Amino acid sequence: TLEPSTSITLAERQQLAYDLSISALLGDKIYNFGELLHHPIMETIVNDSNYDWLFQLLNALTVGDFDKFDSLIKVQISKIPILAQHESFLRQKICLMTLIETVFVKNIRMLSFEDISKATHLPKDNVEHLVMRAISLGLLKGSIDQVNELVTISWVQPRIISGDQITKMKDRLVEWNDQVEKLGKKMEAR
């Protein structure tokens, strides 16, 4: 809303965008992961102080190492300790998105369960929850084959990223396409 307009001050800018970036963590969220960080809140905010963290939290939004942060933690963040949870939520979800984004590409779903889920480097008995929680994460679709140790999954995993299925895209999309013409040769032609 300010984006087009409204000249401001930095103490305004960062502190708000701090408080913003704070409120990201007092969001936390449907993750996020990545965000408006791209937008000129950064340098500007991060830089330093908690912005260091705040930025390193973007790292935590990727890294998801407790003690790359639970080291960092002072009161203000530990003031809401639930990021330790939220990071577990992160580490799951963080690991998840790409897994969801990438690992299967080949109609990505299964991710099922355990080692795959512990590939989040968050463990099986938490898989028994964090993984188990789905939209009890707020997100995951699908269900569980516990026996076979298999998630059923479906979407509600969006993202802003790029770079990848770009490639994979046209391949199949050329593939049928090509192999069309085989058929697509004479059908109406002949």
Add this chain to the structure above:
Amino acid sequence: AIRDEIAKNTELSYDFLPLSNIKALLFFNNEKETEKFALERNWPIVNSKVYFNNQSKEKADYEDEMMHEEDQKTNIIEKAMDYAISIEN
């Protein structure tokens, strides 16, 4: 020439067979006699046992584009039947 059949027969009959039995089947004395064949046969073999993990040649290039073209054939068949619709003139 006998045993190559039996080899396939064992292959067929046995995923796994004691390197004994096969030799016993091969009438061989040394199983390394056998072992050569089986590995000439390229048979999965652990200790004491000829195996067939794949008893057969499955895939391997040709015999394609027909007989397992899903819609393609079908579409060809369509195309064909459409020519049964088209050559219908």
Add this chain to the structure above:
Amino acid sequence: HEKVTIAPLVLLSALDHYERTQTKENKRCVGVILGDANSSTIRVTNSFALPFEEDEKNSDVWFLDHNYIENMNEMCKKINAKEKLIGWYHSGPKLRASDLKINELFKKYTQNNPLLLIVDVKQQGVGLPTDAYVAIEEKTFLHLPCTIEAEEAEEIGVEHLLRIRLTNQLKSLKGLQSKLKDVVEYLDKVIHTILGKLQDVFNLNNLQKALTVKTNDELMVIYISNLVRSIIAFDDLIENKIQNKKIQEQRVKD
């Protein structure tokens, strides 16, 4: 939202306008478009060339009068009340930001935010030679899809024009072609959000399941009619010449 009808009658004369105006790529023949704009579907009844001037040597520089529309609508009204201004057209094929300005003129003249109309005066590629836009906001403008109505009255004289499956395939490439590039475009154009917006639905493929069998199972019966499809042939034309020739090849009396 209110996505709209299209009047071919428009479309036609529209190019006549373009034609009449001898508008060229330098130019876009512009004009009213008519209908009634209330519903979540808007209709295009008609449309009117607005005698106009366009200059992109200076973008905002261009000339038009409303007062056409003024006198126009009167008659239009006098012609029909249902004319009520839905928006306007131009040639196009594409936008030029001055459109925005131009758009807003009609805002005075329209109920809703009025309706832009692009036309491809060369009708070049595909479905529509046309886009219709409504402004927005970080501005917005947007294309809601649109299409023809009946207008069978149209469709009939239409019928006097013209005169199975492989096509259906054919577009298969098309979007994909651009698509990947369109990334690589924007990728290496800006080397936006909407791309990722696309990215998700992508996995919506390799999706296929033994539900596939159903297909197979289904396809079976589809073929069952086979023996029937030509069975009647099998039976029908074969035993037909045996009753006409025996009658005939033997007819042959005197």
